[PDB]
Amino acid sequence: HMNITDIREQFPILHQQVNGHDLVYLDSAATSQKPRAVIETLDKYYNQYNSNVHRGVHTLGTRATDGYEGAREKVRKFINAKSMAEIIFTKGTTTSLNMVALSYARANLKPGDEVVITYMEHHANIIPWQQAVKATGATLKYIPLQEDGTISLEDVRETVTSNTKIVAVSHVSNVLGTVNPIKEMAKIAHDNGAVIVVDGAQSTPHMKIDVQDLDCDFFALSSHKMCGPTGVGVLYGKKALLENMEPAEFGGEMIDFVGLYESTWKELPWKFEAGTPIIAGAIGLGAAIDFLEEIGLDEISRHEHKLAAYALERFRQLDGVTVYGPEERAGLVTFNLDDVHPHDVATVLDAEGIAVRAGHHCAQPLMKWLDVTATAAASFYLYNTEEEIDKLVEALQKTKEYFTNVFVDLEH
C-alpha cells in the first residue's frame, strides 16, 4: 500500500544521470538518501532557530532546545524505549558501541569473563570488544555460523557460558542479509547472567524496532542509514544499566558540580552527552523518523521483502554468479561473478549509472569465513524498484559477456 513513484519524488538526489545513464542507486547499506522533509528540516533549523540548547533563556534558545529534546522523544517512541533517559544521541552506531565497550565492558570485565560475538559482525561490533578484552585480560569468543550464514540457537547456548558477561551481535548483517534471532539470544544471555548488546545499524532503517520485545540491554543505530543526517546516531541502554555506567566523555553540558579536582554528573541522558550536542543532525533525525513512520516500517519491510525475493530469483537466472547468505533475508544481495573481481564489477556498473559496493564491507572475518577476499553488494531501500533490479541483472549479464569477450580476444 505504499506508492514508490510518490516516494521517489521526495528524494531529489535520485533524479540525475551518471555517465549518461539514469542513476540507479543500489548502495543504501553503505548510506541512504534523504527526502526533502529531512533536508528542509535542516534548512529551517539554520535559517530560523539555530541557537545553543538547554539554556532556554532567549526565544531561539528555547526553540532549538524544544526541537532537540523533541527529537529525543521521537527516537524513544520510534524504538519503543520506556524513557528518554534511555536514549543517548551519539555520532553513530560505532561511537555508541564504543561507549558500551568503554563504560560497561572495561569496568565490568575481569580475567575469566567472556565477551561473545559472531563471525558475521561488522568491525564496529568487533574491534571495541577486542580492545576491551585486552585491557581487562578477559576472553573473546565467537558463535559459529551455519552453512547458509545463519546462527543456530544451540550454538549460542554452547558458546555462551556462565562466565559470559557480554553477548554482542548484529540485528541484521549488512553482508549476508541475515536477520538474527535477537529476542531468543537475549533470553540465553540473560539466563547466563550476561547483557546483550545489539548492533542495529542495518535493522533500524528497514524494519520495526521494539526494544521492549527484543529485551536487548543496549541497542545502537546510525541516522545516516535511515534517511537522516550524517554524523548522528543513538545508543539505547536499559535505564538501570546506564545509571551505573560512568560517562565515556567529559566536559561541559554533562556535569552538575565542577570543583578544582572532582566533578559530579548530570542525570540521564545528559550524563552521556558531553559538549555542545549535534543539534541540527538530531532534529533532522527526528524528521527522518516522522517520515519513515508516516510510510510505516511494516510497509517498508514488506516492500524490501518483495525486492529481495525478486532479486534472489533474478540472480539465480544468471550463470556463474554466487550469492551469499540465506533465503529469508533483509533487502540486499552480496555476490560475486565467477572470474570477475568485484571491484571491476562495481566499476563497470557505475559506467551504466548503477551504484553498488565492492570490498570487505568492514567484515573481514566474515570474508575469510566465506573463503573470499571481497564481494560485490547491492542493497535496497524504500525508493528502489524492480525495474532497478532488472537493470542490475541486465548489467551483470553484459558485464559477464564483456569480460568473457576480452579474455577470448586476448587469447591472441
Place this chain on the structure above:
Amino acid sequence: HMNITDIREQFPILHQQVNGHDLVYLDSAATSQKPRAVIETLDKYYNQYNSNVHRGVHTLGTRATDGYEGAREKVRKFINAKSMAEIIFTKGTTTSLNMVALSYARANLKPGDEVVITYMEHHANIIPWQQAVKATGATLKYIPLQEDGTISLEDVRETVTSNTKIVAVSHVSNVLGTVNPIKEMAKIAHDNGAVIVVDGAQSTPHMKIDVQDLDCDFFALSSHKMCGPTGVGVLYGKKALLENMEPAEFGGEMIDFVGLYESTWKELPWKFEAGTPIIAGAIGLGAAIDFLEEIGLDEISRHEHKLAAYALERFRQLDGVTVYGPEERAGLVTFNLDDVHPHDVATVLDAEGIAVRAGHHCAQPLMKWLDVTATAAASFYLYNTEEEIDKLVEALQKTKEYFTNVFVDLEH
C-alpha cells in the same frame, strides 16, 4: 574594509522579530549563525552527491569523498598545519580534548607527573584532565590569574615544573575575553619537557590561527562557533605525537587488518576516524572556512576589536554594572547588574528581542574565582553592529530602571 550590511544579508536567521522587536543576536560565544554559503553547501550535498566516502567505486561515492577530504585540506590551510595527517575531524572541541586526555594523557602519565591547567578554563578543558590524573595517580595543578583575569608568564614558569607532562590552556576565554600568551606558554611547556594542548574553540572563529607560529602540540576547535554545521570539530596534533597515540575509538574505517582477536590501524588521519564520518558537516565546515577566508580573519578580528572597545566604553557609561576581565580582549563582555540576577537580565533582554547568555558559562571554577554565582554575557561576531550594542546598553539601562521601580513600588 568589510561591509557589515552585505555580511548580514548572507545570514537569513538575522532577519526576523522576537516578541515584536527586531532580533538582536548577541550570543555567538554560545553558538554562531550560518551564512547561505554554508546552508546551501549542505543542501547541495544531500540533493546531489551524498554517498559513503573512501570507496570511490561509483561516481557519487567519488564526489562525496572528494568533498570530505577536500574539506580536510581547507582546514589544514586554515590553521596552517603542515599536513592533512595532523587534521582529525571530530564531533567538536570537547571530543577533541577528550581524545588527547584518553590517548595521550592516560598513556603517558605516572604518579609524580603533573597536568597543569588554569582557573579560567571551560569545563571541556578541565574534566578530561581531572579524569586522566585520577586514572593514572598523577597530579592536577592550576596556574593562578592576575587581578584583571590575565595570565602572567612568571606564574606559568612557577606552576610548570620538570615533572609537568601536559600544559592545557584556553587560547581565548569565552568568559573574560582574555587572549592568553599561547606562543610563550608553548616555549615554557617545551622547556620543561611538557606538551601544550590549546583549547581554541573561542579563538578559531574570530582570529587567524597559525599552529606553526603558536608551536602548540594539540589544538581543538568547534565548527558550530565559526559559521559552520553543528556536530563537527577538529583535533590538530603534531604528526609525530599522533603517530605514537593509540586510537580513542575503534571500528570500521580506522583499521587496516582485522583478525579474530587483533587488528592493525590505518595511517593518519583515518586512524582516529572510526565509523562512517561526519560527511555533510565536514563539507559544510569547509564552506564556512572558505566564507570566513574570503572576508579575511584579520578583518573579522579588526571588526570585533572595534565592537569590543565600543561595548566596554558604553558599559562604563552605565551605573551599577560590573564588567569582568581585561581591557584588551576578544569580542565579548561578561557582566552583572548590581542587585539584578543575570537570569532576569537575560529574560528581560529577550522581551526586547535581544539574545544573550546567563549562568556559569561552563566555567564554574572561574565563577568562584570571580566570587559570583553567575553572570550575563554578550558576545559578538562578524554580523554584529554598534547599533546592536546601543540597543543592548539602552535595554540594560531600562532593565535597571525597571527593577529599581518594582522594588520602590514593593516598598509598600
